[PDB]
Design a protein around this nucleic acid. Structure first.
Length: 50
DNA sequence: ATATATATATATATATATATATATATATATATATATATATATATATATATATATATATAT
């Protein structure tokens, strides 16, 4: 369904007594290439509601 | 008929440039440490004035 240039995003948000911590990630291709090493990755960690 | 060979597609490697993090190196400002002049303490010779005292005069 998404063979060409694309981006992907997942994010789990956990909270305790109103304090946020938002795990996450991004994964994008820049061209039709579909090999493992072509995957551009970027993992994110945060605690800011913004 | 089987297998051959070229054109095609796709997965991988190579070249090149940008930016960042790195290693080697220079120089800098900082701190430890040593050296010094100086003042103060410890000990001493020489001697005085002193307290304690023997030796002692004097007394009952």
């Amino acid at each position: 369904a998404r063979p060409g240039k694309t981006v992907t995003g997942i994010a789990a948000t956990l909270e305790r007594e109103g304090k946020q911590v938002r795990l996450g990630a991004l994964l994008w291709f820049d061209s039709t290439s579909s090999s493992v090493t072509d995957m551009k990755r970027l993992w994110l960690f945060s605690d800011n509601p913004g």
